[model samples]
Target: MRVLIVKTSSMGDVLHTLPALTDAQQAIPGIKFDWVVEEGFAQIPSWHAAVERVIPVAIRRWRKAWFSAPIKAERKAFREALQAKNYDAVIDAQGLVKSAALVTRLAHGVKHGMDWQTAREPLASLFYNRKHHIAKQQHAVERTRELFAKSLGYSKPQTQGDYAIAQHFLTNLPTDAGEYAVFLHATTRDDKHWPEEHWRELIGLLADSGIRIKLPWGAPHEEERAKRLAEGFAYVEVLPKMSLEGVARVLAGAKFVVSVDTGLSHLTAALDRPNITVYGPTDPGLIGGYGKNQMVCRAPGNELSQLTANAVKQFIEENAEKA
Candidate 1:
C-alpha cells in the first residue's frame, strides 16, 4: 500500500512521525510512504525503510523568497512531484491549521488526522476523510502511532514505541562503539539549558574516570557553548560542523548519551539506546525521551542550575549497573 504523509517541519516533530510509520509497516505489510517534510529535514524520513520517496518543500525558505522566479520554479517542481503518487492513505500527521492546507493539496483518498477535540488546531479535523481521537496526554510518538493504527484499521499496540530504524544504519562506527557518551547541550530555549558549570563538573567526573565525552552543537553559538563546556576536560571533545543526519550517526555510535530536553535527545531515546536525559523546566513524563534505557532527571521551576552533577551521574551509574 502506498501512503502519503504530510508532516512538515521541526526536527523533533519530524522524528515523532517515524515511529508511526514503523507501526503501520508492521501491521500493514508492504506499506510504503511518500513523505512531505520541510526541505531542511528531508534526510530524516529517508532513513526509515517504510518511506519510498521524500517530497521536500521549501515553505520556510520560500516565504522569504516571496515572488522570486527561482522559488516559483521550485514550487512548480514540488507540485508536480507530489502528484506522481496517489496514496492509499493520506495522513496529516501534524494537526496544525497550516498542516490542514496540505490536505487539500493531495489527491483525495483515505485522509486521516486527529479529531476536533484532539487536534492541536481543532479546525484541522474538518479536512480529514477520517478522524481519530488520540488522548492529548499521550506522548507525541504514541499519538502519531494511534492515528496510523486507527486510520489503517490496525489495533494500536500496547508497547511503548517501535521506531523501526535499522539497527546497523550507522555502520561506519567502530566495532567497539561503546567508547563515548555524547552530550547534547544545545537547545533553542534559555530555560531548557543545563548550567555550564554543572557541565564542567560533569565533564571532570567523566574525564577522570576515562569515559570519552562527545558534544554536538547545531548553531554557531551552540558550537561556542560546546567549546566552552569542553574547555578543561581531556575526555570531552566538541564535534565539528555537522548535519542533522551526522548528529544521528554520532548518537547511534555512542555507548550512551547525556542530553538536555532537545530534539536529538528525543532522537537518542527513540533509538532505544542507553541515555540519561536531564530536564530543567519541562516535565519529563509528558515530553522527555521514553524507553527502558532512558533515565531522566528533571529540575522543576527555575531549579535547572540547582541540579547536582552527582545526581545526573547517579542516574547514569544506576542505568550502567542495570546494563
Candidate 2:
C-alpha cells in the first residue's frame, strides 16, 4: 500500500518519525511511504527503507514572503507535486492547524490523525477523516509508533522503537570509526548551551585518553564557539560545515557523542550511538534521548552552571569505550 505522511520541521521531530515507518514496514510488508517534510529536512525521510518519495515542503520559508510572485509560483509547483498521485492513507503526524489546513488538506487520501483531545492543536483534528486516541505520558517515539499502528490497523510492537536509517550510513564505515568522539556543542537556545569553560575542561581531562574529539558547528558564531572550545588542544578538531546527511555519516561512525539539548543530540540518539546529553532546564523523560546506550546528565537544581565539567567527564568515561 502507498501512504503519505505529513510531519514537517524541527530536525528532532522529523527524526522521531523514522521508527514508526520502520514499524509499519515490518508489520505490513509491501507498505511504502511518501513523506512531506520541511525542505531543510527532506534528505531524512529517504534514509528509511519504507519511504518511496520525499515531498519537500517550504511552509517555514514561504510564510516569510507568502504573497510574492516567486513564492506563489513555488507554492503552485508544490501543489502539483503533492496531488500527482493518490494515497491509500495520509497521516498528519504534525498536529498543527497550519499544516493540516495548508499541506495535509491538499493530499488526496483518507486523512488520519490525532483526535482533538490528543493533538497539540485541537482544531487541527477538523482536517482528519479518521481520528485516534493516542495515550499520553509516552515518549515521543512511542507516541508516533502508536499513532501509525492505530491508523494502519496493526498491533504496536512491544520492543523499543528502531530507527532503521543507521544502516544507510554504516555500509561504508569511516576510516577513523570508533577512534574519535563527536561533541555536539551547538543548540538553538542560549540557556540550553553548556558553558565553554566546561567544554575546555572536558577536553583537558580527555587529553591522554587516546580518543580524538571532533566538534561540529552550524552557524558562524557556533563555529567560533567550536574553535574556542578546541583552543590549545591538539586532540580536539573543529569540523568543517557539512550537510545534514554528511553529519549523519560522521555521527554513524563515532565512538560516542556528548551534546547539550540540541537537535543533533536527538540525531546521535537516533544513530544508536552511546550518547550523553546534558540537560539544563528541560526534562529528558518525554522528549530527550530515546535509543540504545543513551544517557542523560540533568543539572543539579536545573541550573546548568551547577553541572560541572568533572561531572560530564565522569559520565563520558562511564559510557564511552576506550578509543
Candidate 3:
C-alpha cells in the first residue's frame, strides 16, 4: 500500500509523526509512505525506512510572496510532484487550516484527517474526505498515531510508540561516540532559556565525570552564547555549525543530552537517547519529550533562573548510567 502524509514544519511535530509510520508499517506489510514536509525538515522523513519519497514544500517561504510569479511557479511544480501518483491514503496528520486548505486538498488520494472536534483548527476538517475522531488531552505523538491507525484500517498498538529512525543514525557512529554529551542550549523563545550561569555551573560540576560536553548552536548569536558558556571549561567543546542530519548524527552517539525546550530535544528523544528537557514558561505535561529515558525539569513558578544547575546535575547523575 502506498500512502501520502501531509505534515509540514516544526521539527518536533515532524519527528513526532515518525512512530505512527512505524506502527502502520508493522501492521500493514509492504506499506510505504511519501511525506510532504517543510523544506527545512525534509531530512527527517527520509530517515524512516517506511518512507519512499520526501516531497519538500516551502509554504512558509511562499507565503511571504504568495502572488509573486516565481512563487507561483514553485507552487505549480510542487503540485505536479504531489499528484504524480495516486495514493491509497493521504493522511493530513497536521490539522491546520493552511495545510488542509492548500496542501492536503491537492494530493491525489482519499484525504483523511481529524474531525472538527479534534482538529487544531476546525476549518481544516472541511477539506478531508474521511475525518476521524481522535481524542484530545494525549501526547502529540499518540494523537498522530491514532490518526494513522484509524485512517489505514488498523488498531493502534498498545505498546509504547517506537520512532524506528534511531537505527539509521546508530550505524554511522561518530568517532567520539558515547564519550560526550550534547547540551542543547538554544531555543526560539528567550524566556525558555536556562540561565548561562546555570549551564556553566553544570559544566563545572561534571568536570570530573570523564564525559565531555558538546554545545551546538544554530544562529550566530547562539554561537556566541555557546562560546560564552564554554569559556574556561576545558571539558566543554563548542561545535561548529552543522546541518540537521549532522547534528542528529552527533546526538545519536551521545552519552546523554541535557537540553532546553527545543526541537533538538525532541530529536534526542527520537534518537532514543537519554534527555532531560528544561521547561520554563511552557508546561511539558502534554507535549514534552515522548520517548524512553525522557525527563522534564520545570522551573519553579515558571522562572527559569530558579531552576539551578545543582538540580539538573543530580538528575543527570541519577539517570545517565542506566539511560
Candidate 4:
C-alpha cells in the first residue's frame, strides 16, 4: 500500500507523527509512506525508517511572499509536484484548513482525518472521506497514532510515543570518561525558559555527581546563556551550532537529555532516550516527553522557577543513572 501523510509545519508536531509510520508499516507489510512537511523540518521525516519520501512544503515562506512573482511560481511548482503522485490513501494528520485544502487538491484516493470537533480546526474535517474522533486530552503523539491506526483499519499500536533511527546517524564527539547529560536551552517562547539561577544550580549538581554537562543552544542569546551556565563547572561543554541531523547524533550518544518543552525534547523522547522535560506554561499530560525512562517537571501558576533545581536534580539523578 502507498500512503501520503499531510502534516506540515511546527517541528514538534512533525516529530510526533513518526511512530505511526512504524505502526503502519509493521501492521501492513510492504507499505510505502511519504510525508509532506514544512521545508524547515524536512530533515525530521528522514530520520524515520518507515518514511519513503519527504515532500517539502513552502507554505510558511509563501504566505510571507503574498502577491509576489516568486510566490506564484513556487505555488505552481508545488501543486505540480504534489499532483505527480497517486496514493492508495492520504491521511491529513494536521487538522488545519491549509493542510486539508492541500490534501483535497492533490490526494488521488480516499482521504482520512479527525472529525470536526476533535480537530484543531473544525472546517478541516470537510475534506476527508473518513473521520475519527480522537480524544483531545491525549498527547499529540497518541492522537496522531490513533488517527492513523483507525483510518487504515489496523489495530492500535502496542507501544506508545514515536521512534527514530538516530543510532545510524551518530557523529563522534570529544570523548568523556564519565557519562554526559545534554541540555536543550533554546525554546521558541521566552516564558518557557527556566531561571538562569536554576540552570546554574542544576549544572553544579550534575558536576558534583561526576557527570559532564553538554549545553546545546540554537539562538544567538543561547551562547551567553550556555557560557554562564558552564562557568566554574568542570567538564561542561557548549556545542556549536548544529544541523538537525547533527543534533540527533548528539542526542543518540548522550547518557540523558534535559530540555524545556520544545522540539528537541520531543526528538530526544522519540529516540527512546532518557529525557526530562521542564514545563511551565504547558500541560505535561497533553504534550510532555514520552518514554518509560522520561520524566517531566512542570511548574504551577505559570512560574517556571517553581520547578526548582532540586526537583530536576533529584529526577535526573534517579533517571539519568539508569540510562
- Listed in order, each prediction's TM-score against the native is 0.94, 0.98, 0.98, 0.92
Query: Which pairs of residues have clashing backbones in candidate 4?
Result: none
Q: Which lDDT tens digits does candidate 4 get at residues 73-190?
A: 8777777767778888889999998878865547677889989889889998898899899999877777888998998999886676546555455435435512787988888788
Model 4 off-target regions past 4 Å?
Answer: 170-178, 300-302, 320-322
The lDDT of each candidate is 0.81, 0.90, 0.93, 0.80
lDDT of 1 by residue, 1-323 (tens): 99888888777788877878888888888999988889888988888888899989877688897679998898788878887766788888889877577533464467888999999899988888888999998788888888889888899888767676636365576554678888888887887889888888888877667779888877889989899998877777888888877777788878888888888887887666688878877888777765678887776553788888888887778678643
Worst 10 residues of 3 by lDDT: 314-323
Best prediction by lDDT? 3
Sort by lDDT, best first.
Answer: 3, 2, 1, 4
lDDT of 3 at 212: 94
- Tens digit of lDDT per residue, candidate 2, span 1-323? 99999999789999999999999999999999999999998998988999998988899789999989999999999999899989999999988999999989999999999999998799999999998888767887899999999999999999999988898888877889999999998987788888888889888998998989999988999999999999999999999999999898899888888888888888888888888899987888856878968888888887877889899888777665622
Give me the runs in candidate 3 sitting further than 4 Å from their true place: none
- Give the lDDT of residue 155 in candidate 1: 92
lDDT (Cα, tens digit) per residue for candidate 3, span 104-208: 999898999999999999999999999999998899999999999999999999999999998998778899998999999999888999999999999999898
In terms of lDDT, the poorest run of 10 residues in model 2 is 314-323
3 or 4, greater by lDDT: 3
